[PDB]
Curated annotation (Swiss-Prot), chain A:
This protein's name: Centromere protein R
Motif segment (LXXIL motif): 75-79
Quaternary state and interactors: Homodimer; mediated by the coiled coil domain. Isoform 3, but not other isoforms, interacts with the cytoplasmic tail of integrin ITGB3. The relevance of the interaction with ITGB3 is however uncertain, since isoform 3 is mainly nuclear. Interacts with CCNA2 and MTA1. Interacts with NFKB1 NF-kappa-B subunit. Component of the CENPA-CAD complex, composed of CENPI, CENPK, CENPL, CENPO, CENPP, CENPQ, CENPR and CENPS. The CENPA-CAD complex interacts with the CENPA-NAC complex, at least composed of CENPA, CENPC, CENPH, CENPM, CENPN, CENPT and CENPU. Interacts with TASOR.
Organism: Homo sapiens
Induction of expression: By estrogen.
Full protein: residues contained: 84 to 177 of 177
Free-text comment about domains: The DD1 domain (also called RepD1 domain) mediates the corepressor function and is essential in the triggering of apoptosis.
Coiled coil: 1-30
Superkingdom of origin organism: Eukaryota
Expressing tissues: Widely expressed. Expressed in spleen, thymus, prostate, ovary, small intestine and white blood cells. Highly expressed in testis and colon. Isoform 4 is expressed in platelets, lymphocytes and granulocytes.
Transmembrane region(s): none
Swiss-Prot record, chain B:
Quaternary structure note: Component of the CENPA-CAD complex, composed of CENPI, CENPK, CENPL, CENPO, CENPP, CENPQ, CENPR and CENPS. The CENPA-CAD complex interacts with the CENPA-NAC complex, at least composed of CENPA, CENPC, CENPH, CENPM, CENPN, CENPT and CENPU.
The organism's place on the tree of life at top rank: Eukaryota
Entry GO CC: cytosol; inner kinetochore; nucleolus; nucleoplasm; nucleus
GO biological process, one term: CENP-A containing chromatin assembly
Function: Component of the CENPA-CAD (nucleosome distal) complex, a complex recruited to centromeres which is involved in assembly of kinetochore proteins, mitotic progression and chromosome segregation. May be involved in incorporation of newly synthesized CENPA into centromeres via its interaction with the CENPA-NAC complex.
Tagged with keyword Metal-binding: no
UniProt keywords, alphabetically: Centromere, Chromosome, Coiled coil, Nucleus, Phosphoprotein
Span of the entire protein shown here: 53 to 283 of 288
Protein name per Swiss-Prot or TrEMBL: Centromere protein P
Compartments where located: Nucleus; Chromosome, Centromere
Family: Belongs to the CENP-P/CTF19 family.
Stretch forming the signal peptide: none
Keyword Aminoacyl-tRNA synthetase: no
Source species: Homo sapiens
UniProtKB/Swiss-Prot annotation, chain C:
Protein name: Centromere protein Q
Modification Phosphoserine occurs at: 84
Sequence similarity: Belongs to the CENP-Q/OKP1 family.
Subcellular localization, as worded in the UniProt entry: Nucleus; Chromosome, Centromere
Complex formation: Component of the CENPA-CAD complex, composed of CENPI, CENPK, CENPL, CENPO, CENPP, CENPQ, CENPR and CENPS. The CENPA-CAD complex interacts with the CENPA-NAC complex, at least composed of CENPA, CENPC, CENPH, CENPM, CENPN, CENPT and CENPU.
Coiled coil: 9-43
Biological function: Component of the CENPA-CAD (nucleosome distal) complex, a complex recruited to centromeres which is involved in assembly of kinetochore proteins, mitotic progression and chromosome segregation. May be involved in incorporation of newly synthesized CENPA into centromeres via its interaction with the CENPA-NAC complex. Plays an important role in chromosome congression and in the recruitment of CENP-O complex (which comprises CENPO, CENPP, CENPQ and CENPU), CENPE and PLK1 to the kinetochores.
Swiss-Prot record, chain D:
The protein's assembly and partners: Component of the CENPA-CAD complex, composed of CENPI, CENPK, CENPL, CENPO, CENPP, CENPQ, CENPR and CENPS. The CENPA-CAD complex interacts with the CENPA-NAC complex, at least composed of CENPA, CENPC, CENPH, CENPM, CENPN, CENPT and CENPU.
Source organism phylogeny: Eukaryota, Metazoa, Chordata, Craniata, Vertebrata
Presence of the UniProt keyword Transport in the record: no
This protein's UniProt keywords: Centromere, Chromosome, Coiled coil, Kinetochore, Nucleus, Phosphoprotein
Protein name: Centromere protein O
Coverage span on the entire protein: 89 to 289 of 300
Organism, scientific name: Homo sapiens (Human)
Paired cysteines (S-S): none
Gene from which this protein is expressed: CENPO
Length: 80, 224, 103, 198, 103
């Protein structure tokens, strides 16, 4: 079950990925301007990611426990 | 009791036909009536949930019917709709716009057009995903806006197609296509013809010349 | 009679001239419209897009003129693109997405 | 017994159809085909509704309708009847909604703000061309012409304003006419008139 | 007698006007069609040749430390979108997680 290993390694990776996330203020400086958030599609905001990762853990473990893994013809195909 | 069962079956068939023709499947509907008479004023609150084939919604509004001797004015005093929390920010922007404009029919029609364009985008991306699996790299998935083309010989050279769906202030829905190239400067120093800066405009002219999928497959073949 | 017969005769002369021009242009365009598809294939019913999308402003120039300090951000954008941590993160995300698409 | 449950199902499905009645477009099954009811509303104000009769037999034909004649329905029928009939219905909804909104704006202008208007404003049946002169209370005469080159939108495609009977003598007239032109081009008709009337 | 001449001359003038209009429209759409086709062909050929005559220099040096110009910043930024949206993407799949466990 390599899923445990990948979860552990991403959890250990999280600390330094947020460390390098906060390394530069230019990324934080461009935050809050919708002119780029609408262009990229959603937003530029990663501050509650700790809760996201600590919440996905139980969800993924539960998933593992449960093991979840023309117009004529179109109109005539419905009336039948 | 066979006649009653026959009428129920006929009504169910008609309801299914209307739902699959219009494209809207509604959930349960609730109605409340309040009489505020001073010339008569009635406040009617309606609530209903539903879905369009891909997306669910839950709406609740109230209208004020003013019955007079010669006129019967109906105005949507308040409306409030809720979506599911998807990643489409423009969807929320349009929801806010419709909320502050207090209109209903344009919302339904725009939602229909939006899901229509979304389904064409998804079906087009997924077809090209399987047609040339050795030259396509769908990084985000068929339900996204990005498309990533890359050659397995060299991972350094790859580009992206951005397909966006936009809703104007009036309420219409229109798509847009563009490409972004992640090319190293080694190509710039190799070729002095300088045929990479004009890629966007030329590509948009190309897609307006012989179609969308034709231009995409031509690009795939040229990159092959 | 004089003015309006003059008008219609000038008009029909112009009509004949334009007909000859369009005929010669249509005969001339053939050679290049088969020459274009020599080394390329000639040509899923997707409706053709409107001209408004064709004449709409493109995204690359808007992005370039919208964000300042290109090099000041690139000096770390290249470094992070050369870093392997978010590359492994992206590979994990892609594996999860293809797992979902497999079902 | 089963009668109560059957009646409950009947009333529930009737309520569901009455709910579909409010989405703007409704349909009813008849012997010759389907009868479609189309509704128009502008800014939440419901207006008159129309109906169209269709035939299911191939090829699709039109039996009769009550749409006004000046609405160009023949061409759109010829070019979208046989394919994507729902798109045809949605385009017809666009046309009717725009036309009803334009008529409502014109009627509200005619009825409500009759004091500022001096003479009757020229109007065409399609309501895609307006031309009127107005005096607002000093005296600042203006004449405005609005042309609607599109039929699927309620906003003017081009608006022009001129000062008739008086020469431009101050920048106040220039700024007033520029503001009127911008308001006409962007905001609805009656909204701006109700705005600067106070 | 001349009244009939009036009427008939107006007749041919009127019935020839639309033909002139249609011919003008056909000509001035065909010209731009041909120009656009030629330009697209030129661009496609030039890009194909650039890729073909580059395809070997990358093979000469597989892992050269190659940086990117200001024109590649948008795409790289568009690559960073999910990088700043992955957590939000998780929410979506987290929602799908409930959609998966509604049983």
């Amino acid at each position: 079950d390599e899923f445990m290993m990948l979860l552990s390694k991403v959890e250990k990776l999280s600390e330094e990925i947020m460390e390098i996330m906060q390394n530069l203020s230019s990324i934080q400086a461009l935050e809050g301007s919708r002119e780029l958030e609408n262009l990229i599609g959603i937003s530029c905001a990663s501050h509650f990611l700790k809760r996201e990762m600590q919440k996905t853990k139980e969800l993924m473990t539960k998933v593992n426990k449960q093991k979840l893994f023309d117009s004529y013809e179109f109109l005539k195909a419905i009336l039948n | 009791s066979k006649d009653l069962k026959n009428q129920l079956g006929h009504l169910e068939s008609e309801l299914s036909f209307l739902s699959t023709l219009t494209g809207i499947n509604i959930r349960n509907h609730s109605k409340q009536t309040e009489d505020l008479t001073s010339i008569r004023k009635v406040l009617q609150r309606h609530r209903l949930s539903g879905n369009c084939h891909m997306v669910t919604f839950q709406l609740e509004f109230q209208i004020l019917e003013i019955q007079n001797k010669e006129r019967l004015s109906s105005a949507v005093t308040d409306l409030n709709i809720i979506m599911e929390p998807t990643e489409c920010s423009e969807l929320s922007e349009f929801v806010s716009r419709a909320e502050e404009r207090k209109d209903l029919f344009m919302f339904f029609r725009s939602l229909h057009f939006f899901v229509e364009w979304f389904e064409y985008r998804k079906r087009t991306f997924k077809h090209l995903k399987e047609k040339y699996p050795d030259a396509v790299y769908l990084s985000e998935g068929p339900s996204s806006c990005s498309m990533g083309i890359r050659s397995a010989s060299r991972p350094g050279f790859e580009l992206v197609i951005v397909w966006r769906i936009q809703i104007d202030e009036d309420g219409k829905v229109f798509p847009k296509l563009d490409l972004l190239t992640k090319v190293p400067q080694r190509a710039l120093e190799l070729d002095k013809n300088r045929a990479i800066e004009t890629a966007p405009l030329s590509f948009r002219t190309l897609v307006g010349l012989l179609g969308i999928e034709a231009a995409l497959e031509s690009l795939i073949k040229s990159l092959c | 009679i004089d003015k309006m017969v003059e008008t219609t005769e000038l008009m029909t002369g112009n009509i004949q001239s334009l007909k000859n021009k369009i005929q010669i242009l249509a005969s001339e365009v053939e050679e290049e419209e088969e020459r274009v598809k020599q080394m390329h294939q000639i040509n899923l019913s997707l409706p053709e897009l409107s001209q408004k999308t064709l004449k709409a402003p493109t995204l690359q120039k808007e992005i370039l003129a919208l964000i300042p300090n290109q090099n000041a951000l690139l000096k770390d954008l290249d470094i992070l693109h050369n870093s392997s941590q978010m590359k492994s993160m992206s590979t994990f995300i892609e594996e999860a997405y293809k797992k979902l698409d497999a079902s | 017994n089963e009668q109560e449950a059957l009646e409950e199902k009947l009333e529930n499905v009737k309520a569901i159809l009455q709910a579909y009645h409010f989405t703007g477009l409704s349909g009813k099954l008849t012997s010759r085909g389907v009868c479609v009811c189309i509704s128009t509303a502008f800014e939440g104000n419901l207006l008159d509704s129309y109906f169209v009769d269709l035939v299911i037999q191939k090829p699709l034909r039109i039996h009769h309708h009550s749409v006004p004649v000046f609405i160009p329905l023949e061409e759109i029928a010829a070019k979208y009847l046989q394919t994507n009939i729902q798109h045809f219905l949605f385009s017809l909804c666009e046309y009717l909604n725009a036309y009803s909104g334009r008529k409502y704006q014109a009627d509200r202008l005619q009825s409500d703000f009759a004091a500022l208007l001096t003479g009757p404003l020229q109007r065409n049946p399609l309501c895609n061309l307006l031309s009127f002169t107005y005096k607002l209370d000093q005296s600042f005469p203006f004449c405005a012409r609005l042309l609607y080159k599109d039929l699927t939108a309620t906003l003017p495609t081009d608006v022009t304003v001129t000062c008739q009977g008086v020469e431009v003598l101050s920048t106040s007239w220039e700024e007033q006419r520029a503001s009127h032109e911008t308001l006409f081009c962007t905001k609805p008709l009656h909204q701006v008139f109700a705005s600067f009337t106070r | 007698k001349k009244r009939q001449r009036m009427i008939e001359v107006q007749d041919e003038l009127l019935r020839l006007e639309p033909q002139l209009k249609q011919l003008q429209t056909k000509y001035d759409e065909l010209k731009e069609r041909k120009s656009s086709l030629r330009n697209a062909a030129y661009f496609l050929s030039n890009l194909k040749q650039l890729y073909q005559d580059y395809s070997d220099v990358q093979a000469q040096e597989p892992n050269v430390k190659e940086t990117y110009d200001s024109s590649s910043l948008p795409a790289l930024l568009f690559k960073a979108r999910t990088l700043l949206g992955a957590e939000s993407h998780l929410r979506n799949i987290n929602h799908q997680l409930e959609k998966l466990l509604d049983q």
